[PDB]
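Hey Z.,

So I finally got round to the magnesium ion thing we talked about over coffee. Here's the setup:
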Amino acid sequence: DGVYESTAVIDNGSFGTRTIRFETGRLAQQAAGSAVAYLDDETMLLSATTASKNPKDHFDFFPLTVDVEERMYAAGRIPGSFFRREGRPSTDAILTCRLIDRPLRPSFVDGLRNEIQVVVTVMSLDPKDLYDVLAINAASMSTQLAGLPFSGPVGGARIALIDGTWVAFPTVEQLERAVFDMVVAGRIVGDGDSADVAIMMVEAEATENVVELVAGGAQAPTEAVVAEGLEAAKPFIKALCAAQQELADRAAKPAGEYPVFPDYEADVYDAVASVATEALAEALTIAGKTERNDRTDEIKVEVLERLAEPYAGREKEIGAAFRSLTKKLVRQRILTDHFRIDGRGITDIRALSAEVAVIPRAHGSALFERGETQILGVTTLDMIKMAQQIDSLGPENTKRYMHHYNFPPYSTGETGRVGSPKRREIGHGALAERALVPVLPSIEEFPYAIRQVSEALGSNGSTSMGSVCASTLALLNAGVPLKAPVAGIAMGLVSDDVDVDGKVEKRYVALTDILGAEDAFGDMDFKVAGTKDFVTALQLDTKLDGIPSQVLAGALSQAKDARLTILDVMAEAIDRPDEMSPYAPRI
Amino acid sequence: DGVYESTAVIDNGSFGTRTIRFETGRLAQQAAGSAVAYLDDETMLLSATTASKNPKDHFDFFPLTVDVEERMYAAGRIPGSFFRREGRPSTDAILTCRLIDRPLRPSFVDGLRNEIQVVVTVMSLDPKDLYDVLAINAASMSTQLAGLPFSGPVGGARIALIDGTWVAFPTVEQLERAVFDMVVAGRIVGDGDSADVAIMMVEAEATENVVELVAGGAQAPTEAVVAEGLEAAKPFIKALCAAQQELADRAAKPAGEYPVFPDYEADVYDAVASVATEALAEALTIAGKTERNDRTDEIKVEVLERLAEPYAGREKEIGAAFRSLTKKLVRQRILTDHFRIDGRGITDIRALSAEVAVIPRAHGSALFERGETQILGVTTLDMIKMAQQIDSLGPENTKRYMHHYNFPPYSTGETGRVGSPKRREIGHGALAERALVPVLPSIEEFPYAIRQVSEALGSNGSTSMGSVCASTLALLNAGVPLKAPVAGIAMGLVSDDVDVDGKVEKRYVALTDILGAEDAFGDMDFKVAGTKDFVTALQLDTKLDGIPSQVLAGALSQAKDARLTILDVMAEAIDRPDEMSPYAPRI
Amino acid sequence: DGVYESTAVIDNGSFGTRTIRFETGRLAQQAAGSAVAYLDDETMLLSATTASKNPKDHFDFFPLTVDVEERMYAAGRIPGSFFRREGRPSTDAILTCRLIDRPLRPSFVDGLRNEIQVVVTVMSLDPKDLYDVLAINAASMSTQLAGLPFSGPVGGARIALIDGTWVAFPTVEQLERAVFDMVVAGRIVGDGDSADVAIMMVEAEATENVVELVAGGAQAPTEAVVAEGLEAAKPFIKALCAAQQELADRAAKPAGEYPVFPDYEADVYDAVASVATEALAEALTIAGKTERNDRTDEIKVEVLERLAEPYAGREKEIGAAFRSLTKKLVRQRILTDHFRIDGRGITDIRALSAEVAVIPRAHGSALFERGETQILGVTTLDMIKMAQQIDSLGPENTKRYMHHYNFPPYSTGETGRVGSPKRREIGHGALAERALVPVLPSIEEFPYAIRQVSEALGSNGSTSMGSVCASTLALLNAGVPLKAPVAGIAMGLVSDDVDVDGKVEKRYVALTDILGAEDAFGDMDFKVAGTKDFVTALQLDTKLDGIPSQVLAGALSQAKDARLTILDVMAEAIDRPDEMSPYAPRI
RNA sequence: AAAAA
RNA sequence: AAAAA
RNA sequence: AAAAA
Ligand SMILES: [Mg+2]
Ligand SMILES: [Mg+2]
Ligand SMILES: [Mg+2]
Ligand SMILES: [Mg+2]
Ligand SMILES: [Mg+2]
Ligand SMILES: [Mg+2]
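And the result:
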């Protein structure tokens, strides 16, 4: 009676027809919201969102926590541990936690301080399905039901390019003819007539068989093909969002009253603006970097002195308002004068250097530095029996090529805990590993168990693409006969309204090779890695209400040009797979 | 010279004669108290109790911590880990920590805030003895010596029903003819002539051979037999308590001065009583649940307003006194009008529903919900080589049937840490696992390695018995040919003085299927699980100075009636072991 | 261009010639200081020191943290874990962290509160070199560069006694003819003409082949030989310190401004001195221990009352000044009247008792107590297949004899966390294990995998030498045919200026078997363990600017006399290897 | 970490 | 721990 | 660390 259902019928043409079914009202009725998601009546996940009672205001950020529980009775097996129990999250559970957390975290209003928490449990899994793109839907549903200030729903799909057809939610036996495979997550903006979706997250990779299939006669995953993919995942996200909205229009709890804690009030920001606008503006027109820093520090002292004490005991509000003001002014500058915070041009990569044979007695090694970023990659071939043995719900058994990404605390100069990797390091390692598997040689043409270790010896921001380039260098050095070198580049996009003399219109600009500071002044950040001919990895997080096709194509072609320059810089360090190190094993 | 001994001679008639020897003054003379306990001059434990110097008042509870250290040189073996060192506590060490903590925690006075800590180390273990029932004695002794406000000593024994004889402290080769096996822990009340013991803890289970032995001609462990057992463990607890008291009358340190921190003073409680007694009393006479909640909230606002500020800055005392007052009034109501906090009768179980075949692609599964409680059990048969390999001091080698109990944070609606299980979850898993081993089929009639996973999807209190019922359902579903289904029920008992017109006498009442709130209004809480014919598991924690035999027999027969109703509700979901799932292995 | 080098040429005569090369300016340019250290162009470590921005004043101690990262690509191998990743630090990484932390921690000025941190990463390792004595140099260099208040540099070397020649930085194939092997770390004091080094740390052990080699005709590592070793490691420390100083005179960052937080100001200490000097002095002349404690407590009450409130809200300064005053007066007493804090003489060991056959059903066991210290050792022979399998950069494969050292919290009477061992326990276990390997029987004459467990049942200070004696007792008891028993003793040395009637001269005194309190009144603390004929382990931490050869020889001969008395006390408990326990395995 | 498966 | 054984 | 390777 109190169990409500709603289905979304995914229509893949002649490749089949799937049905994702959302059900609520039966299981876990104590959480703030709960929802069970079935994929083809056989895959079954349970998501349950709970919010804390009191807002922990001592925090300075929104404390959302996603957990994915891979129960092993889903696979019909007993865990293989010594204690026959499911222990700590595997790598796939962490990657799915990140997939869920990325489009869900910016969906909550700005200033929420309660401790929201989502826990997606895999209760059944058909051995031919993937569940992460279903975990996104289950989490969005169970958060939409909870009555939180969650501007959803958030529909997520996975599309694969099989024989020129973009198949949505493909099985595992179908992901062996696909050249490209991407997870797209978005939401619907506009009602009735302008209901187009607004993609928020893209995580794309070229399958391990892209080279053989493209040699067979397929179409390689270039940038135009990736744009066709981004435009061919919209109907499915529309279907999923419509189904979630039907269910939550049946059985949603009325919106609770959660207090929001803004960083600064309106009065303080208006005051800082009115009394420092022209000062900060003329502080930005000067062609000097460090001098501009000194002038900004002086303006900081000035706002601290002249606003004391008309606003007594409100120093954090002053600082937050000043940071918002300088961010707005730098954004307007980047939009109008095309000049970035370090005098660089929009299409200028920092100073590149690639060196091979850095570490002695290593099988292969290389040091790739770009600007302040400096990565060291060390490839360690070994016996094929050393391939990592995977034990999880996922379809794969062994991992021949392992990419491990270390981010020591002194990369930025800050002390901290050295030890176990965080979730960021797992995400960066996975992103930089899925960018090299398309070009690795076969297990018959090169029978070893490669293992890559990338060290962020110096960091300014977004070191995963630098790690892709350093991994290509180290892998060519160790003697591994890659099919083609894979470069990488991490760009951003700033979009906003500007007023010419009497017109107020939106304009966009792309920034090549952004720093860590240019990530807070950007409205989209995306990382493209690929060879000379096709993209092997792509990742994109945005919050804009839709990007025109021309702007996306332009930014992606700019990314290709950056990749080609980086590739011509890398091809001077090492052109071909060098000789095996005398310490390397021989098979 | 300063080494004092005292022996307790356990006289098991014709089954032997044991001697537990307590020794102090030689080892670990830096702790607040220390004592070595020998069982038959060969089993040797060392317990050492230490108290912190300053009372950590910021805590809101008594911070006692028990640890049991299973040193492996006791078993004559080197640890088998990769690092050849004893790592984290096994399951048996955790269960023994709980066995010690359960009768020891209520023995300290109310309001102690120092950080007491007990650490029992197993220094030698004969391979034919059990040491947990000896760990209780060692811990009680070493805490009685420390000069703490510890109202001991606490004597603990293990009795087994072998051929109609209740044998105390039986070996492992003797626990194979026993039908029932129970650990009893109690203390002596009354001096000289009325020195009868007052049992505080019972943890009982029917041995894995109960069905075969009862078929042979034994007497099945019914409720009258369990009462005979509770009355046949009194002389041994008397002996152990007398020995500990001899030793601590020889070599105990004078009682130190430890401050106590009451939750509320006498003045505040007297004031709240005098000014809210009749209001809260008439607030309880109304037949409405939610309306009564609103009236109690109104009385809370009233006590907060009219007592402000005659007691300024004393809000916690107000709240604690109000909670004590409402608890006392609800207790008097339950004693007089037989009506509980939710209008239920004393012999009324909540609304039951049992469903099988819930999860798809699972070997067996079932969902059992009772009231707000809702448990999901998933049975996963596999190959016999997957039985858990145990490596510890304990006598068992492998664990064929594994019960794992998960309590997610959203069971109550609260966010929290998802991950490793606490000690409560280990205790509940063990209690619900020892309730099903008496009825599991042999390793020859059903050659698999069963594994059960019980999920507390919805929780109000005491979900372990619900997990026993859900495990019976899931196990019958997966095709496992049980010998008889095993139900469970978690009851309580409220006992107190009441005054009829001119007489003040003690009366008792039993409450069937208590909630989580009816656990703070009860003077005993006990859980009984069993088949149609005999109890397979029992657990009981009390603080009363002895219960008449009639009251205990009545409460236990009431528990049997609850079990029979639950069993007739479960027999409609699934009557017989269903067909094996096509995914299950075939041997 | 910005990459600076400096080499130190170690000249081992006819045994070879090594070259340690320090390089800076290329890798990890974001840390406060960074330096790469090469040993023979093939071993390569990277050290990077970072300091926090703000001084965490809430701490009560200097928060330095050293980490050693053993990257496995150094050894050309993939890690062997299930997850094929380097997990938690091995034992060798912890011992190297301690080797670095011991001479580095007292090098920083007194009162630093920022959170310094050193992280030494092993990027390449020739399989014939050791890297810990190189890690000390890399850490001292990268800390000298950081611009901290670090009074370095600190040069560390390893010398081995091969055929009467003290070889510096010997390989692994050369450490098989050495009888003694010691790590020496020191710094240079005096400039120009009196530039002699001032050793700060010594960690010495006799190689596993000392007995066979001494039988061959070598010179056993007596105390005079160890003194010759301490005098033969000075030129190499001079070379290393000169090289580090050349580099840091090329490319060091100017000293930053770090605030220091003294424990007490000058005014408070001067006041407490002026108003309590004679009171505390006459409080020390009395021959009563406990009475002196009462008088000191009375003087504490007096300084708290009469200095209140001329210094209001300054209680911690009062306490720190009082502790400094009493420490100074006890030091002057020990220097002048030769009387220690407990009336003992300078050459008096506490009351010794050694007992064997303590624990029943153990392969071997013994209890050795000295004063308040009381250690229990339990030897557990087993099958040779149980030897610990090591997987790390280090040269060793298996560990036949394992010494595990447990320090329970109740050793001092304080509650705490029972569980994983700290770094102190690893250091003490290693120190007490390297003291028994010289005398263990071969793998052919006694084919078992011994394992020792030492329990600090009672502790006053420095229980590692007591654990060496208890391990000798337990090992003789279990039937292991040692080549000679190994005793141990932990002495200290107090050195200071004293003024006779008109002369102010430095005098030294040695204290045999110091307590835990006599460690804060001592200017050096060293532990010597050995057999009747030679030292098998030695450890020494000092801060003095050089000790005359006569004083060191005297203190070491005093240590030998203490060892001989302890050995004659141990030889009465058990003279010869007893019979194997009937539970022990037979090979 | 962290110093005593 | 969740964001940067 | 625990109590609920
Ligand atoms: Mg970015
Ligand atoms: Mg991104
Ligand atoms: Mg209960
Ligand atoms: Mg109970
Ligand atoms: Mg010492
Ligand atoms: Mg020392």
